[PDB]
């Protein structure tokens, strides 16, 4: 078996929505739960902070802080084993009996116009920040906004702070224009959950030009287990996920590929990747296609080679 790094799940959004109905220990309805993370042999799971687009502007910060509190109270020190990775040394020094968990921020909506709110989140240990979800916000346009604009000054100022703090700038969800501008501005670039658009043409995916640029930037691309972004017909299994891995390798990105499941953030599943406990069976499926060294690259080593430094 091999340890796993997965950059993106929406367990916090789901736990929050559940209103106490879900036990993180073992709830079957949670794609990511304690028992399943153990089964996965998880090394590091990214937990996104994300609010429904319908949480009003005046409550977004409160609800985000609530998610951070859910993380601290119900995820963290689960089994004593879940260990909060708040800085990159925490991961590099992680005890072998621990499973690392980091916070990431999916769109800067919760900070309003206040950079100090972002500072608070970074101090709290957020290690990757997506400037946008799908919508227009004060930092940039996300991919679903028809205007498709790039970065605002605020967006640029945010990226500068991220660079300074050795935090990833996450391009998943950005408009095409914001993507290109972000590559010029950001020092530590990741796509925490995006697939290849040549293989599945959803606008949420990255085209060949974008993928080549990511590689040139020495960025990480973390493939996502959502059938809608995996196959054009919307029905997908693990071999279909591998077609994206193949494609990125073909574009020169063997060492730039990781996993970003989007577990708990998706209405249906890739067959064979129904929940995070399926990870080990998926890695063995990979053995028909790639060497153990290459698979270890996808599972953890690529990400580990790209920590902000």
Ligand X SMILES: CC(C)C[C@H](N)P(=O)(O)C[C@H](C)C(=O)O
Summarize as ranges the residues that interact with Zn ion (CB under 5 A). Answer: 10, 48, 50, 106, 265
Residue with nearest beta carbon to ligand X: 265
- Residue from 10, 31, 109, 240 touching ligand X (CB under 6 A): that is 10
Residues 6+ apart with CB under 8 A from 201: 232
Euclidean distance between CA atoms 42 and 5, whole angstroms: 6
| Rounded least distance, CB 171 to ligand X, Å | 12
User: With binding defined as CB under 6 A, does residue 226 bind ligand X?
Assistant: yes
Site string for ligand X, 187-206 (x = CB under 6 A): ------x----------x--
- Listed in sequence order, the residues at least 6 apart from 6 whose beta carbon sits closer than 8 Å to its beta carbon are 40, 42, 44, 45, 46, 222, 259, 260, 261, 263, 276, 279
Q: Does 61 bind ligand X (CB under 6 A)?
A: no
CB 263 within 8 A of CB 10: yes
Query: Which of 248/304 has CB closer to ligand X?
Result: 248
Closer residue to ligand X in complex, CB, 259/290:
259
What is d(CA 11, CA 32) in angstroms, rounded to the nearest whole number? 6
User: Does 71 help bind ligand X (rule: CB under 6 A)?
Assistant: no
* C-alpha span between 16 and 98 (Å, rounded): 25
Decide which of Zn ion, ligand X, none touches 266; Cβ closer than 5 to 8 Å per partner kind: ligand X
Which residues, numbered 21-40, are part of the site for ligand X (CB under 6 A)? none
Q: Is 221 helix (H, G, I), strand (E, B) or coil?
A: strand
Identify the residue among 4, 27, 266, 299 touching ligand X (CB under 6 A).
Answer: 266
The set of residues, in sequence order, having a beta carbon less than 8 Å from that of 292 and lying 6+ positions away, is 2
Q: Calculate the CA 37 to chain-centre distance.
A: 16
For residue 169, what are the CA distances in angstroms to 46, 163, 229?
14, 8, 21
Tell me: does residue 106 bind ligand X (CB under 6 A).
Answer: yes
Sole window of 76-84, 90-98, 248-256, 258-266 interacting with ligand X (rule: CB under 6 A)? 258-266
CA–CA dist 66, 71 (Å, integer) = 9
- From the CB of 284, what's the least distance to ligand X, in Å? 26
Q: Which is nearer to ligand X, 174 or 304 (CB)?
A: 174
Footprint of ligand X on this chain (CB under 6 A)? 10, 13, 50, 106, 193, 204, 226, 262, 265-266
């Amino acid at each position: 078996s091999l340890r796993v790094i997965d950059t993106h799940c929406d367990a916090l959004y789901k736990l929050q929505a559940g209103k106490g109905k879900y036990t993180f220990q073992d709830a079957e309805e949670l794609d990511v739960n304690f028992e399943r993370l153990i089964e996965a042999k998880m090394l590091l799971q990214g937990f996104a902070i994300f609010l429904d687009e319908d949480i009003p502007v005046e409550h977004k910060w409160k609800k985000a802080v609530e998610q951070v509190n859910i993380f601290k109270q119900h995820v963290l020190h689960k089994g004593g084993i879940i260990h909060h990775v708040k800085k990159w040394c925490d991961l590099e020094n992680l005890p072998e009996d621990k499973i690392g968990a980091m916070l990431t921020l999916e769109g800067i909506e919760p900070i309003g116009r206040d950079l100090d709110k972002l500072t608070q989140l970074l101090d709290g240990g957020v290690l990757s920040v997506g400037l946008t979800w799908n919508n227009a916000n004060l930092a940039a346009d996300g991919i679903m906004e028809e205007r498709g604009a790039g970065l605002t000054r605020f967006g640029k100022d945010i990226i500068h702070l991220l660079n300074e703090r050795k935090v990833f700038t996450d391009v998943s969800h950005l408009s095409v224009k914001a993507f290109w501008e972000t590559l010029e501005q950001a020092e530590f670039v990741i796509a925490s959950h995006s697939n290849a658009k040549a293989i599945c043409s959803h606008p949420r995916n990255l085209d060949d030009e974008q993928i080549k640029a990511m590689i040139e930037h020495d960025a990480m691309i973390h493939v996502v287990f959502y059938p809608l972004f995996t196959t054009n017909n919307g029905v997908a299994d693990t071999e279909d996920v591998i077609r994206h891995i193949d494609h990125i390798c073909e574009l020169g990105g063997l060492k730039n590929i990781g996993f970003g499941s989007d577990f708990d953030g998706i209405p249906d599943h890739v067959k064979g990747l129904e929940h995070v406990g399926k990870y080990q069976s998926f890695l063995e499926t990979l053995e028909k296609h790639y060497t153990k060294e290459e698979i270890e690259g996808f599972a953890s080593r690529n990400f580990l080679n790209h920590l902000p430094k």
